[PDB]
């Protein structure tokens, strides 16, 4: 097979938008391989902690809802390191939109 990197294949567009957003340049990273996705979440998590009073939103381009599940398991994990292990997720299919839980427990 002809192996190549062309922006037209399974390009995964990760977009994070922060509530209490300070110096938030873009938080947008497009990875064709999940090996690179690891570094996205390493730096991203660190920032969301500062640019985020309680939570920030994320939406990742999943080409299948099967992928949306495992990127959800990653985003839930990332915000679980920041605070609450329970995180808010919605599986669309073309996208997985994950935002951290608001402090509401009794």
CA distance 65 to 6: 23
CA distance 64 to 81: 26
- Whole-angstrom CA distances from 70 to 23, 42, 106 are 29, 16, 30
12-18 sheet: strands from edge to edge: 28-31, 12-18, 56-61, 95-99, 88-91
Residue 28: left if φ>0, alpha if ψ -120 to 50, beta else—which one? Answer: beta
What secondary structure, in 3-state letters, does 42-86 show?
HHHHHHHHHCCCCCEEEEEECCCHHHHHHHHHHHHHHHHHHCCCC
- Whole-angstrom CA distances from 2 to 6, 12, 33, 48 are 12, 20, 17, 39
Element (H, E) at 37: helix 34-50
Domain spans of the chain, in order of start: 1-106
> Domain spanning 1-106 has what CATH number?
3.30.1710.10
């Amino acid at each position: 097979m002809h192996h190549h990197h062309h922006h037209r294949s399974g390009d995964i567009q990760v977009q994070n938008n922060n509530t209490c957003n300070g110096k938030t340049f873009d938080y947008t990273y497009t990875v064709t391989t999940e090996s690179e996705l690891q570094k996205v979440l390493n730096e991203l998590k660190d920032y969301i902690k500062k640019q985020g009073c309680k939570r920030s939103r994320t939406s990742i381009t999943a080409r299948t809802k099967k992928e949306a599940e495992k990127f959800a398991a990653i985003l839930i994990k990332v915000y679980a390191e920041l605070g609450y292990n329970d995180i808010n997720v919605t599986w669309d299919g073309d996208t997985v939109t994950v935002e951290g839980q608001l402090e509401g427990v009794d």
